[PDB]
A paper describes a structure:
Therefore to obtain a structure of the CBC–ARS2 complex, we co-crystallised m7GTP-CBC (CBP20-CBP80ΔNLS) with ARS2827–871. A P1 crystal form diffracting to 2.8 Å resolution showed convincing ARS2 peptide density. There are eight complexes in the asymmetric unit with variable occupancy of the ARS2 peptide, probably due to the relatively low affinity. The C-terminus of ARS2, which is only visible beyond residue 851, forms an extended chain that wraps around the CBP80–CBP20 interface, interacting with both subunits. The principle interacting regions of CBP80 are 460–463, 557–570, 607–616, and 647–651, and of CBP20 are 48–55 (β1–α2 loop of the RRM domain) and 71–80 (β2–β3 loop). There are two main interacting regions of the ARS2 peptide, residues 852-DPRAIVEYRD-861, notably Asp852, Arg854, and Tyr859, which bind in the “proximal” site and the extreme C-terminal residues 868-VDFF-871, notably Phe871, which bind in the “distal” site. The electron density is absent for the intervening residues 862-LDAPDD-867. In the proximal site, Asp852 electrostatically stabilises Arg854, whose guanidinium group stacks on Tyr461 of CBP80 and forms a salt bridge with Asp107 from CBP20 (left). In the distal site, the side chain of Phe871, the extreme C-terminal ARS2 residue, is buried in a hydrophobic pocket formed by CBP80 Ile609, Cys616, Met648, and His651 at the base of the long, solvent protruding coiled-coil of CBP80 (residues 650–705) (right). ITC measurements showed that the R854A/Y859A double mutation severely weakened the interaction with CBC, whereas F871D alone did not have a major effect.
The nuclear cap-binding complex (CBC) binds tightly to the 5′-cap structure (m7GpppN, where N is the first transcribed nucleotide) which is co-transcriptionally added to all nascent Pol II transcripts 25–50 nucleotides after initiation. CBC bound to capped RNA not only protects the transcript from decapping and subsequent further 5′-3′ degradation, but also acts as a platform for interaction with nuclear factors that determine the fate of the transcript. Here we take a biochemical and structural approach to investigate which binary and ternary complexes CBC can form with three nuclear factors, PHAX, ARS2 (arsenate resistance protein 2), and NELF (negative elongation factor), all of which directly interact with CBC and are involved in CBC-mediated transcript processing. We also determine crystal structures of CBC bound to ARS2 or NELF-E peptide that explain why CBC–ARS2–PHAX and CBC–NELF–E form mutually exclusive complexes.
Residue numbers in the entry:
A (entry chain C): 852 to 861, 868 to 871
B (entry chain A): 27 to 486, 497 to 527, 540 to 670, 687 to 790
C (entry chain B): 4 to 151
Write the structure that this text describes.
Amino acid sequence: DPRAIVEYRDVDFF
Amino acid sequence: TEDHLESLICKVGEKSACSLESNLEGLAGVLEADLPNYKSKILRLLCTVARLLPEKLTIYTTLVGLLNARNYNFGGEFVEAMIRQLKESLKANNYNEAVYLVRFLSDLVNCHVIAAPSMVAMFENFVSVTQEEDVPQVRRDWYVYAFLSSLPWVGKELYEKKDAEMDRIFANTESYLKRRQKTHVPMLQVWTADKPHPQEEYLDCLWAQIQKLKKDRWQERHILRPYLAFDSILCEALQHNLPPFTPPPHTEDSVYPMPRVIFRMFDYTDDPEGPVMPGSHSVERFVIEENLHCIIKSHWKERKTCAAQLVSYPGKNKIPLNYHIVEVIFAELFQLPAPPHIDVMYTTLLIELCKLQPGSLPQVLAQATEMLYMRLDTMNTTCVDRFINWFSHHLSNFQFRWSWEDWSDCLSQDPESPKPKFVREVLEKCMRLSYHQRILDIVPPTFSALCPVNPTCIYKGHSVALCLAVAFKSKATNDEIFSILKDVPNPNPLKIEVFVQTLLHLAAKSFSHSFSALAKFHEVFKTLAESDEGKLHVLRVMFEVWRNHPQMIAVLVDKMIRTQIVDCAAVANWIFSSELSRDFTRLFVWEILHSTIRKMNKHVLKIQKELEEAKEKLARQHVLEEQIERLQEKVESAQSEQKNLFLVIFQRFIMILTEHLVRCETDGTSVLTPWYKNCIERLQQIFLQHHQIIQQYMVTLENLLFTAELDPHILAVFQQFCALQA
Amino acid sequence: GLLKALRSDSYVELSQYRDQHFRGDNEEQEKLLKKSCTLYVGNLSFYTTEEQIYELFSKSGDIKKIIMGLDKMKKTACGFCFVEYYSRADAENAMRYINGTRLDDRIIRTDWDAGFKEGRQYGRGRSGGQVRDEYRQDYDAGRGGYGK
Ligand SMILES: CN1CN([C@@H]2O[C@H](COP(=O)(O)OP(=O)(O)OP(=O)(O)O)[C@@H](O)[C@H]2O)c2nc(N)[nH]c(=O)c21
């Protein structure tokens, strides 16, 4: 897999 | 023994050590023993299997035959119970269940439970519905269909007992079918072409099949009839008369099935090695496909069970079962207006079928896929989308393995044409399930022209965007970002341009980051796009940032509608605008439109159910009655918003279709271009997807939009839509 | 009426899994699991992007929320996620037709969840990732490599 392990760091009215 | 009774009645006909005849004999005995004090249960359970398991029709009629022979009064009470259940089903507009009950009563004549003159009397009354005036075609259609579709089972037995009476029915039936309207057919055909196979109208086709059956002395070669083995016992059994049957009359509460068009892609020459496939106009082909459809209807939730039951389908003679299964599956997937079950089920069922028959099924599947590709030129756009979605999702489950060079003929054709456009969209869909680089690998180097682009952000008041960049990075508040937007020169569309470009660029890493950005600066968005032309500009800018990543556009437009940054009307206009003129034929546009329409329709539904949950709370109890007056107002405002969304959409279709048709006769060019094919069929799609809602707007649509003044090309689509319930 | 044999819906029944950090009784958890619109999705690649999860799971219905499964220390994708739908029916269809099919060439497994809370996105393994990645002997390129 030639791609990176992604880093995830940081209300319905209708 | 009630739990035991149900499983005993259900299990007969399935896999067994003993034969079918043995199990029926045994069960008929066990059921007669339980008659003294479970007669009520057994009548109701046999009525239920008559209604819910039509794929096992002849197994259960036989069972009733044997019970009738041992106990006449049971057979009497059963025929009464079935007539009650039939009237119950018709009153409740369950016309599809009613057919199964009619066929059950029909085949009970073959088991010497019902007297043949009674069924001819009932069918006299059915076909007499074609004489009734001031009633819709679909009502008449159904009553004919219930009669004609019973004849493969009982057509011999009725014609030998009362041929005089039956010839009148065939005369009245034939006269009706001649004078029927066929306006619907171009809307429901998967392919407009009639080579290699005409996509026939469902009653025309059944008629042809019933004629060939009559011409062959009512001899058919497929239907398993267990009752023939019990001929000794069933001759001596005493018959019952059905009461005279008055068909429940038409009311404006009545809802009849839409007309259909018979899907057809195979004849015997597609499988020369295996058994000979019964032809399009044989009742064998009708009974096979009907039962296969019913098996899926009975087991759609259990994909592995559903595959097993299809593969183990019994018949009197051998048939190329893998071809029939693949056909019946694609017949449902491509059915118009809609498939009977959620689209994705079919992808999975086909996989479970490959697992269950790995030596043969994948080859038949690949052959069919090839044939579908070859016939793309006249395939309806609604169906082509389903084909794209199925095929891309299938490939994603088998390492994207496909002989792409088999389709090299697309590379020399016009990019707008159905075949290369099919391949482009398939590969675009593959990329979404995979990643850009993996799609470049799995295709030949001659096909990388048709590959999708890399899904990247296009980032572009030069100094103002640099200020905002710093403020977002530094974890600033809404007050500060709004303050920075004061310094912008007005030619205010440039405030939105510098805000959207910068926020989406800095949150371009994933969907979660982009969703966090919209939520964090929600108030800045709402202020910038409270204007109608402010909404239109947020969509225009957001497109220019993400025009390489269609999936991101779609999920953003969705979030923007859900949080009220924009509204459905803005998105509707935006789709028919000139900025998406180049990409108008591409799929993602119509994904976004339909997603938008769905949010609107669900919003109405939720408000509508808050209303009935309040009215039912009032009925149980007999301030709350004044809450009902408020909700009836919210419903009407919501329904108004809904109606306007459709009226917008239709207006824009009529405009751009008229603009094409006028310029075609002015310049003398061809009308039927690739762009026109897409557009006219995407209009047709709106009607198909939402026919029940659009039916509420008939008066407004006849008077103000779809009038006699329009080019009959555009008006045909509306008259087609009329025909679905007319 | 109906036949019990046809009502059969085995792909929607509850797994044997329960959540340990769940503040509550088992019968109180089961009651939430039977009304949930929220699915645990196991056996993802660490390279599997939200773009892919959204495309696949959209096929059973409109998605409310994807919450990626994160390493507690690194905040990298450690091989699972949660998927929330607006209706039960759409979640039921995911369990019926997406469960046990491929996503990024891996057979993924879905399960009913009692409902997302804060903290549940993080892997509860000792070294930050999922508990499943600490014990295991096998090599698996998409799941990091060897165990830990
Ligand atoms: C295997 N998992 C993991 N999981 C959730 O994913 C997060 C962390 O995963 P984990 O490290 O595998 O937790 P844990 O369940 O303790 O591991 P396990 O029980 O496999 O030993 C938690 O929110 C956990 O509840 C799950 N949630 C549901 N509903 N069903 C499941 O099968 C699983």
